[PDB]
Every structure is written in C-alpha cells, then in structure tokens.
Design a protein around this ligand. Structure first.
Ligand SMILES: CSc1ccc(C[C@H](C)C(=O)O)cc1Nc1nc(N2CC[C@H](N(C)C)C2)cc(C(F)F)c1C#N
Ligand SMILES: CSc1ccc(C[C@H](C)C(=O)O)cc1Nc1nc(N2CC[C@H](N(C)C)C2)cc(C(F)F)c1C#N
Lengths: 302, 298
C-alpha cells in the first residue's frame, strides 16, 4: 500500500463473493456427474461491483469487506487489483470461509439455480471500522448488511464530520437492497439513501414515485432518497420535496443486467462526488447502467 | 526402491464443494451449510486413499501451472503422494468441478468443467521408469492412447519373472463406447454401476455375468453397487459378493467409488484373496460415506 492523498478515495463497505457460474444443457438430476458447456469464476457482491464501476469511471476507490486467508480470497484480491481497486482496508478474519456461490444456468430456458455462500465469515464490525483512518476518503458508501454494527460506523463518520469544515466533510451513502426489517433503521443515515425496487415492492409500493413519497419520512434531515426501477428509469427526492426523474437509456439489445443496480449506484455516487446536481447524477446513473445492460460484465461501460 | 509404489494414472480436478441440507429445485436459491476445496479426480482420490492406507503411491496426470495447480500439488505433497511423473502442460486450464453434496443422504452432484488441457499421452508414458512400481491403475479417459500404455506394461512383464511382474487395473467409469476396449486389459477391471445400467444390466451379478466375456484371460471383473455392496468374478466362474458396510448416517459419498477401487487394489497388492479385497473395499468406502472428505478413514 502506498501514499493515498487526503480526501481522494471513495470507499465501498460490503460483500465480496466468488461466484462460480456453470452453463449446462439441462439441470442436473441429483447424484449425477455431468459436464458443463462453459464455466467462469467471477468476483461478485454489491459493494465489490460498485468498486469495479468506480475505478472504470476514473475514481480512486477502495473496498472494505471481510475475507479469510486462502485461495478463494487470493482469486478475489487479484480480480480487485485487475480492476484497480485498493484492498488495503479488507477486514481479514481468522475464522470462517471467504464467501463462494455456485450458480447453474440452464442454457435451454435461462433458469438460474443458486447455492448461496455459507454465513460462517464474520461481517465487518464497528470495532474493525474504528481502526480505519478516515482522512483518505471523500465518500463512504455502505451496503446494508449487519445494520446494528453499521449504524455505529455511520455515527463514527458523523462524529468525524462535526470537526471538519464543509469542504473536508465525508459524504455518506447507504443502500437498503434486501427486504430485511433490520436494515430499515439505515434509512435514517447518510446524505444519499438508495432503496431497491425489491424493497419498495415488499413494503407495498408499486412505483418509484410511490416508494419515494412513502419512505421519505424515514431519511435524516437534508438527505436524498433514490430509487431505480429497471426499464422505468429512476427517481430521486430531496429536502425541497421535488420529485426528480430520469427515463432509462435502454441498450439496443439487453444481454446482462447482473450488477446493473450496483452500476447505477456507483455512477450516481461518482456524479455527486464530482459536484454535479442530483438531476444530473440521476441521468448519469441511468446512462451508465443502461449501457451496462447491453454488455457482458463491466468492460466497455465507459 | 524397486517394485514398492502403486501408480494411478488419470485426472486431478479441483472440487469446489457446497454441502447442503437438500438438493435445490431448479430456479430456486438455497444456502449451503459449509464450503470447501478438495483435490479430486478419480485417480487423484485413489492416491489419497492409498497414502492414508500406508501404501507408497504416485500420481500421473496432466496439470497446468497456476494457483489452482499450486493448491493441488501442495495437497498431494501433504499426503506424501509422489508427483514426479506429472505431465505439466503449457496450454489449457486446470479442470474444476462444482460439487453439491446433500448432507442428509451423501448424494453428490458434480458439474465438471473439463478444460482443453491435453491428456497424458502414450509418449509421456514411454518416459516412465516402470521398475519403481508393483501396481499400475489406469482411470479410463483417452482409451486409444491408454491401450498403448497398457501394451507397454504387458511387454515389460514378458521379460520379468512372476515375482517382478507389475499388476495392472483399469477403471471403465463412464458409458462412452471408446472406453469399452479397456475391458480387455489389466488383471483387475473395475466397471461402474452407471456403465452396467447403460449396457442394460440391473444388478452387479447381471453385469459381471454379461461382461466377463470382454476381459482378458485370467482377469477379475469387479462391480460395486452403492448400498447393495460389491461383486467380483474371476476365471474360475465363481461369483463373489460382499455386503456394504453403510454408516448409520450417510453424509458424503463424493469419492466413495475411488475409495472402493483404491482399497481393493491395496488389499490385492498385499496378497489378500479377491473375497477379502472385495470386503475391504466395501469396509473402507462405507466408512468414508459417513465422513466429510477422506480424513478419519484410518
Ligand atoms: C435505470 S438503470 C437500472 C438501475 C438498476 C437496475 C437494477 C434493479 C434491481 C432494478 O431492477 O431496479 C436496473 C436498471 N436498468 C435496467 N434493468 C433492466 N432489468 C433489471 C432486471 C429485469 N429483468 C426482467 C428481471 C430487467 C432492464 C433494462 C433495460 F431497459 F435495458 C434496464 C435499463 N436501462
Ligand atoms: C460398496 S462401497 C461403494 C462403492 C462405490 C460407490 C460409488 C458408485 C458410483 C456406486 O454408487 O456404485 C458407492 C459405494 N457405497 C455407498 N454409496 C452410497 N451412495 C448413495 C449416493 C451415491 N450414488 C448412488 C452414486 C453413492 C450409499 C452407501 C450407503 F450404504 F452408505 C454406500 C455404502 N456403503
């Protein structure tokens, strides 16, 4: 690790997982031995994907998440470095496995069957976050996971900001992506709150407009709540009460939407960290995520 | 030392294992109980079991340099498996499999990523000093090349007294027509239940009686059949059977067939009768079925 200039990096806190994806002619019957058509090992995880996009956008970025020493972590660290991501804040654990998932894709109907990673590896704790020198960062994005610990991380960032002039305050964003009640306390933290379409629909909202008007009462004073809604584009709502919208920028052909939400989040964060307005950041998020949907992976998103 | 090692020729594959409570239905998401990496491949698993049984053993197979091969080589060396005969390739990736093991019944589902890594050739085998080995086991893969390897061993044996002859075993594990020429080679032929069922046989007894005509004169044909135990048939025409030794809780059968094969080979290499070797094979493979991996078999 070398010298990182003060207030230069965007940190994403969350999951990194090894996804082993196998394409098969037909779903294997239990207890059978089959050969796949093709296989690929990929680095996944919401915060992990957002770091890849931030590096491709030209932002110095860092990932913070748990990993256990071993060959799975070696593959993931080499893949983070292949995408220019700084991994010096990784919380190395002495117990548990580095997450790894198995995804079987049936080439005859596109069905995806997933065997998700085990929960043995401890999540990043508030005590792990206390050890991080914050001066390095201009923005910290947190993927909502172990909410009670992440609330203490957010309170530490808020305390840091009270002693800084407006120019050296660290901007904060949070993502509430899973419909887990424990995560809903995270709406009250951060300057920017991203809420997924899946969370909005599980809370009874049928559109991004409904979700933002119905959930704005939960954010802290001054915060911007953002909700992307696939082909329907994305909306944002700030303290002035004006609903902002951008239409989607769909590709000529949709080929891969995995990580489109992480691409949208990273692109909104990047645009706002560059001093752009919320309307401009919302449009930029739709532009980059729409372009990504027409490409396999993140190469060529620009 | 001369005639001290057992050589296993075949594949070495990285098995990326997920242990689950139940097999996932198509298009669903389930969470695994635990994850692990295991050095797999049929010949490779048989070397693990031979080293655990206390037999000096060597592996011969293709590998490509890289971090996955570093894990596999370190695992072979940790078990004292001799890797000096490995055919290192400059092209192709290390094969890897996603293995889903059902913890409630030991069922193992494997999705193999077979890479364009070149197989061990007859020219690679020509370079092997055979004096080192008392037994050579071949996992059926590139049959036309492996037939030349077997012919080289047969030619070597014609110039040796009975005490210095190398015993040979072959495994016909996949129902691929190209592999059926391998039945006519070796002193011991292992035929899988899957091959037997694909050729119309519904039991180990049916398979041995129906396929014995394919083995060379004097050979022993062996067929394991999961909970139904295993059978063997030699030149005297007497069918031999062993009941299985199932554990009270079956938790992992990945590599049970390789454990059975290695244990039969070990017992026969120690001078035991075919009946005793068949029982020993069932005993060790049955013990393995009640454990995750191969540790604790001894
Ligand atoms: C506005 S950019 C954005 C931001 C976050 C997300 C992800 C998030 C989970 C969500 O769905 O809201 C997606 C996108 N954007 C698209 N997503 C799409 N899908 C998502 C899955 C859907 N299939 C059917 C199951 C298809 C299709 C398109 C299409 F027009 F090309 C676009 C775009 N453009
Ligand atoms: C006689 S030892 C042996 C030798 C070769 C094999 C593997 C070979 C492919 C075959 O199944 O013939 C298996 C075994 N043995 C067991 N396999 C079992 N399988 C249930 C799920 C798996 N399925 C059918 C493939 C395997 C269950 C038991 C149970 F009784 F504990 C035992 C034992 N004991």
């Amino acid at each position: 690790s070398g010298l990182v200039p003060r207030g230069s990096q965007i940190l994403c806190v969350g999951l990194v997982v090894l996804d082993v994806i196998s394409l098969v002619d037909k779903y294997p019957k239990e207890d059978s031995e089959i050969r796949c058509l093709s296989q690929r090992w990929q680095r996944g995880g919401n915060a992990s994907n957002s770091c890849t996009v931030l590096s491709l956008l030209g932002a110095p970025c860092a990932f913070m998440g748990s990993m256990a020493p071993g060959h799975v972590a070696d593959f993931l660290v080499a893949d983070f470095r292949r995408r220019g991501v700084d991994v010096s804040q990784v919380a190395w654990q002495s117990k548990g496995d580095t997450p790894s998932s198995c995804c079987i894709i049936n080439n005859s109907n596109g069905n995806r069957t997933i065997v998700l990673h085990d929960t043995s590896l401890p999540d990043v704790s508030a005590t792990d976050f206390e050890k991080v020198d914050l001066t390095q960062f201009k923005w910290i994005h947190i993927e909502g996971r172990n909410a009670s610990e992440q609330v203490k991380m957010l309170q530490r960032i808020d305390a840091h900001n009270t002693r800084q002039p407006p120019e050296q305050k660290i901007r904060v964003s949070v993502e509430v992506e899973k419909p887990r009640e424990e995560l809903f306390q995270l709406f009250g933290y951060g300057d920017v709150v991203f809420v997924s379409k899946d969370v909005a629909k599980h809370l009874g909202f049928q559109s991004a407009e409904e979700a933002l008007r119905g959930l704005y009462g939960r954010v802290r004073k001054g915060a911007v709540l953002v909700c992307a809604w696939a082909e329907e584009g994305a909306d944002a709502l700030g303290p002035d009460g004006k609903l902002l919208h951008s239409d989607a920028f769909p590709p000529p052909r949709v080929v891969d939407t995995l990580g489109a939400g992480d691409t949208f989040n990273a692109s909104v964060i990047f645009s706002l960290s560059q001093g752009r307005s919320v309307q401009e950041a919302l449009r930029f998020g739709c532009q980059v995520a729409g372009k990504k949907c027409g490409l396999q992976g993140f190469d060529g998103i620009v």
